[PDB]
Amino acid sequence: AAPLAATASKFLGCAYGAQQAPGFAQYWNKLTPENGGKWGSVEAVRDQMDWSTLDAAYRFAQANQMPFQMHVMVWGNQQPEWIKTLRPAEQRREIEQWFAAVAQRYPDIALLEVVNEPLNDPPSKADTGGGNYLQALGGNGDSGWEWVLQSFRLARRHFPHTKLMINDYSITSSAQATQKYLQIVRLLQRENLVDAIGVQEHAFETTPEVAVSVHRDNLDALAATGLPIYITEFDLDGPTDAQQLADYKRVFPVFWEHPAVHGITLWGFRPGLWRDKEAAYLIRADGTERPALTWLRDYVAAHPG
Ligand SMILES: O[C@@H]1[C@@H](O)[C@H](O)OC[C@H]1O
Ligand SMILES: [Ca+2]
Numbered sequence: 135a136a137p138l139a140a141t142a143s144k145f146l147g148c149a150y151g152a153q154q155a156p157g158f159a160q161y162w163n164k165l166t167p168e169n170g171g172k173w174g175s176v177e178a179v180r181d182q183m184d185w186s187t188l189d190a191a192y193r194f195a196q197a198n199q200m201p202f203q204m205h206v207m208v209w210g211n212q213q214p215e216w217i218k219t220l221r222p223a224e225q226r227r228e229i230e231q232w233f234a235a236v237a238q239r240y241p242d243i244a245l246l247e248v249v250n251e252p253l254n255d256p257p258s259k260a261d262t263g264g265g266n267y268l269q270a271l272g273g274n275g276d277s278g279w280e281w282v283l284q285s286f287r288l289a290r291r292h293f294p295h296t297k298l299m300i301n302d303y304s305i306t307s308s309a310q311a312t313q314k315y316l317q318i319v320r321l322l323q324r325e326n327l328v329d330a331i332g333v334q335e336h337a338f339e340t341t342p343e344v345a346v347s348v349h350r351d352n353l354d355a356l357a358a359t360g361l362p363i364y365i366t367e368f369d370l371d372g373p374t375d376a377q378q379l380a381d382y383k384r385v386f387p388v389f390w391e392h393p394a395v396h397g398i399t400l401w402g403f404r405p406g407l408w409r410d411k412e413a414a415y416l417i418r419a420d421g422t423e424r425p426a427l428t429w430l431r432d433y434v435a436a437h438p439g
Pocket of ligand 2: 177180181228231232
């Protein structure tokens with residue numbers, strides 16, 4: 135039994151970790167580590183690196199010839215706790231060492247997610263896993279996004295052959311948010327710092343009060359940069375099987391059939407994925423496939439692009 139996108143022109147991948155492991159390669163052909171590549175997962179204690187969970191995702195991806203998306207170098211959650219109180223110069227040396235460490239250990243990263251959530255969750259908080267290192271990367275600076283520039287400069291320096299991606303949520307749901315995001319992309323491109331645009335597209339981003347057409351128009355706007363688009367963390371809630379199925383039919387094709395979208399990654403498929411309470415899983419606890427998954431296999435087989 136072969137992955138859904140086996141004969142398609144773009145990948146259909148999934149978040150990977152212990153609860154998503156069973157049967158993974160029979161469904162998906164690309165992966166992102168759900169949690170193990172966050173900095174606070176690897177370096178919870180300063181200067182001792184626990185690569186075990188990240189190694190598990192990378193080794194699995196390689197064993198299965200699937201592209202690996204490193205998630206994530208800079209974010210405002212699940213960052214180490216010890217960095218919060220260091221002076222910015224010291225924080226910066228730690229950031230640099232984290233970049234260099236990842237680059238050395240993982241030579242075959244397909245897509246490096248350098249910054250996730252610049253419009254929503256910058257590393258500027260000092261709560262649990264907040265990081266509080268925005269000023270180590272120059273803060274907002276002249277342009278308003280200096281720290282994003284600095285993060286991508288470090289990634290270019292340390293990963294000279296790797297495709298660099300920016301990622302965020304609640305982008306395609308509004309023109310104003312898409313224009314905001316594209317200002318960051320514009321600033322990055324002044325120095326040719328970014329290679330791909332990611333948008334997460336969780337359930338909360340694609341609800342029907344905003345028409346799918348508006349998401350399509352914003353995809354076109356993002357695509358106007360000439361950069362490839364990736365849908366990075368897709369999920370649709372399933373309080374009933376039928377709501378989930380109807381949502382899949384309404385939402386999924388718009389992203390899948392967009393000529394600038396070069397891959398979609400679901401944010402899990404088995405119970406225990408992030409939106410478990412909302413029953414976003416496509417396979418039930420008893421191992422059975424839900425009607426949205428039945429539909430999705432057929433739809434992807436019929437849409438190779
Ligand atoms: O790491 C993921 C993040 O990028 C996004 O906010 O969705 C939840 C997290 O699991
Ligand atoms: Ca260190």
